Design a protein around this ligand. Structure first.
Ligand SMILES: Nc1ccn([C@@H]2O[C@H](COP(=O)(O)OP(=O)(O)OP(=O)(O)O)[C@@H](O)[C@H]2O)c(=O)n1
Length: 349
């Protein structure tokens, strides 16, 4: 039985060294060709409207870029601001928050003066709509125009590149020096994880406010990309996450798109709360952690509920038909059974 647990760890590491490493290289190649199209479209916007500056810093990754699928991405476009707005998060719009002007006048003081309502709120929808018109003009004018169209029938700004890749470009503001009320419960009082030292840097990472749709209202959607990534450092956590994203790409890309990489990302964080010790994420525990996550994934699909890690009131399955979730449970179960029954199957997965 030690041989079987050891056998699972061995073949998972081969899977990580082979399929996961190839996946990282292939997506990096796709990201490279997709971002130079995005940079050309965005630099066309910025000449027409300098407030939309391209925050595509390669820094060695592209800041603000998130992978959803081997062919789908989201670029977070961070907008300069003066800092005249107050962050307001009551639970009136779950998973959302609002930016209000600090006192009555000084609307002239803001860079986005025309987008502040009479009530004094900075409108996410008005900013995205203006941004959409600018992008729709850029994709007809830029050098790459033959390979970029803009996706239709959506209020989101999405570029379809070479009829293969889809990129959502989401305007956003970075919020530092504040933790949101909707996330103030975290970290849980009892759970040994993370270390209080780790919590203080995660909260120092801040959070983002994104202009996209969710659930009329027009508020900003909360997002914790940078906090999430700092949270999952240490041990084999990220190696586990990479294996999950790879298995999902190759075997759980299903009709209706019930599962995406962010589901895997959320489950790893919850598995960290269920196993808070650093020794639970030792390299020898890689098989136990992956098994626990896959079974946890099956439970979420069967229960029709997969809560957001920082915003437990939010369900990451909301809007997905139960037939698609049930199909994903049946495929995830059969996948987890094959891996556990014979880890050598990973060679051909
Ligand atoms: N902002 C980003 C995100 C991704 N990538 C590239 O795309 C690959 C796949 O990213 P991801 O879906 O997050 O898979 P991971 O296994 O998590 O890659 P990593 O461990 O490097 O984060 C990464 O290896 C990285 O090289 C990038 O260049 N810039």
């Amino acid at each position: 039985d030690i041989a079987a647990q050891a056998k699972l760890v061995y073949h998972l590491n081969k899977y990580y060294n082979e399929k996961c490493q190839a996946r990282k290289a292939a997506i990096a190649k796709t990201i490279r060709e997709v971002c130079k199209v995005v940079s050309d479209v965005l630099k066309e916007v910025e000449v027409q409207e300098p407030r939309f500056i391209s925050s595509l810093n390669e820094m060695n990754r592209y800041e603000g870029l998130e992978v959803i699928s081997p062919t789908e991405f989201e670029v977070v476009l961070y907008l300069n601001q003066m800092g005249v707005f107050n962050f307001v998060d009551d639970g009136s719009l779950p998973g959302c928050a609002v930016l209000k002007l600090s006192d009555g006048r000084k609307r002239s003081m803001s860079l986005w003066v025309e987008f502040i309502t009479a009530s004094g709120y900075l409108s996410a929808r008005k900013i995205r709509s203006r941004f959409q018109t600018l992008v729709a003009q850029a994709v007809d004018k830029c050098s790459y125009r033959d390979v970029v169209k803009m996706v239709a029938d959506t209020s989101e700004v999405k570029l379809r590149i070479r009829d293969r890749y889809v990129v959502q470009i989401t305007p956003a503001f970075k919020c530092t020096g504040i933790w949101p009320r909707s996330a103030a419960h975290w970290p849980l009082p009892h759970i040994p994880w993370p270390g209080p030292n780790r919590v203080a840097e995660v909260k120092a990472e801040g959070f983002n406010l994104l202009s996209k749709e969710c659930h009329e209202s027009d508020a900003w959607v909360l997002q914790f990309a940078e906090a999430e990534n700092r949270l999952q450092m240490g041990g084999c956590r990220k190696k586990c996450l990479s294996i999950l994203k790879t298995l999902r790409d190759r075997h759980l890309e299903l009709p209706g798109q019930p599962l995406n990489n962010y589901h895997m990302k959320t489950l790893v964080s919850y598995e960290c709360e269920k196993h808070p010790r650093e020794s639970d994420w030792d390299e020898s525990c890689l098989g136990d952690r992956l098994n626990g996550i896959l079974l946890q994934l099956i439970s979420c699909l069967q229960c029709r509920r997969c809560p957001h890690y920082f915003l437990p009131n939010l369900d990451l399955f909301q809007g997905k038909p139960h037939s698609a979730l049930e199909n994903a449970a049946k495929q995830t179960w059969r996948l987890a059974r094959e891996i556990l029954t014979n880890p050598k199957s990973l060679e051909k997965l």
